Amino acid sequence: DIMPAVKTVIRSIRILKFLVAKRKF
Amino acid sequence: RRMPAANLIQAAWRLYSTD
Amino acid sequence: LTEEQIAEFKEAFSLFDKDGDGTITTKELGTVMRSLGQNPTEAELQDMINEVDADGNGTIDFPEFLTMMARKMKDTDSEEEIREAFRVFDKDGNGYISAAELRHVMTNLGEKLTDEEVDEMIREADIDGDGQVNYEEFVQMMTA
Ligand SMILES: [Ca+2]
Ligand SMILES: [Ca+2]
């Protein structure tokens, strides 16, 4: 079952996206 | 400014929403 | 430490580190994003990696990846920044913003919010249902 891994991948990209939008603001 | 501010709020909401 | 948590983070790391050298490059981070329908620019991919790249060597290793996963939105300045991002649209300085004014700005501006995503946001942001969002309290709720 790959689903927990995939959910974690999505969360990690959203963390990166959040951290960049914070740097840019 | 407005766009980078919208970006931050959007990104924060979509992260909070992963749960 | 238990191998429960070790399991999911290692597997997740491997989905990025497809070449298995122990590090996530911009090319690999971008590949994963593109495979999820995203179209990042290389500049975006660099900026992302630079936010968690402790040793400045330009890629993400496993400790950096774990550290990032744990940190989430707990960064000390995260409430200040997100809340200051709110103030921008709070014309009057009360610390409040109308629901309607939040949905306006959220939907209209860049990285536009889905009509669903904004519906969920407002339902969590206006707890009274009067149309007034104490955005500090909202930010304090998002920032665990
Ligand atoms: Ca690699
Ligand atoms: Ca590194």
Side-chain angles (χ1 to χ4, degrees):
Chain A
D1 189 31
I2 190 65
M3 195 74 61
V6 151
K7 173 75 149 292
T8 289
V9 160
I10 287 160
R11 189 182 324 110
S12 69
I13 291 164
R14 300 186 169 172
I15 292 159
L16 294 180
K17 274 163 118 68
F18 162 77
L19 295 171
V20 176
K22 190 169 54 113
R23 191 64 54 183
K24 307 278 143 204
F25 178 82
Chain B
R1 320 155 186 298
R2 299 202 130 208
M3 150 160 286
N7 289 7
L8 176 50
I9 297 177
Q10 275 133 223
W13 172 254
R14 301 164 150 125
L15 169 58
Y16 164 76
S17 285
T18 305
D19 304 31
Chain C
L1 188 147
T2 88
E3 165 60 61
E4 313 205 46
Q5 57 262 33
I6 297 324
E8 334 292 7
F9 289 117
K10 192 201 288 197
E11 178 167 69
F13 190 80
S14 302
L15 290 189
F16 290 104
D17 181 16
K18 298 153 160 145
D19 86 332
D21 71 343
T23 196
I24 306 171
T25 60
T26 56
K27 171 155 143 99
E28 310 177 295
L29 167 61
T31 291
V32 168
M33 292 175 74
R34 283 181 286 273
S35 83
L36 291 151
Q38 293 269 309
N39 320 296
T41 57
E42 181 67 22
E44 286 163 339
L45 298 170
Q46 283 179 14
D47 289 347
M48 293 174 106
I49 281 179
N50 181 72
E51 291 296 311
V52 304
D53 182 21
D55 60 342
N57 77 337
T59 59
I60 304 168
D61 65 10
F62 195 59
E64 283 155 3
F65 177 82
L66 279 182
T67 304
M68 168 204 67
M69 287 315 306
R71 101 192 239 209
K72 260 198 66 128
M73 266 186 277
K74 97 196 201 155
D75 314 69
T76 167
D77 72 351
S78 280
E79 153 179 344
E80 180 175 2
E81 293 274 32
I82 300 171
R83 183 267 290 158
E84 185 46 45
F86 269 102
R87 185 172 179 285
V88 161
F89 318 97
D90 174 8
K91 316 272 209 91
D92 78 276
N94 37 33
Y96 288 80
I97 178 186
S98 91
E101 172 85 0
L102 170 55
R103 178 171 198 127
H104 208 82
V105 175
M106 280 304 317
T107 299
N108 293 326
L109 302 194
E111 295 302 320
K112 64 179 180 180
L113 257 202
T114 299
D115 181 65
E116 162 68 295
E117 277 171 346
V118 77
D119 282 331
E120 295 172 289
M121 180 191 242
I122 287 295
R123 195 207 103 71
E124 289 279 1
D126 183 12
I127 312 99
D128 307 334
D130 54 24
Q132 276 263 52
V133 181
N134 183 342
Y135 55 79
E136 263 201 7
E137 297 192 310
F138 180 56
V139 168
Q140 302 164 359
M141 172 294 287
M142 275 198 303
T143 55

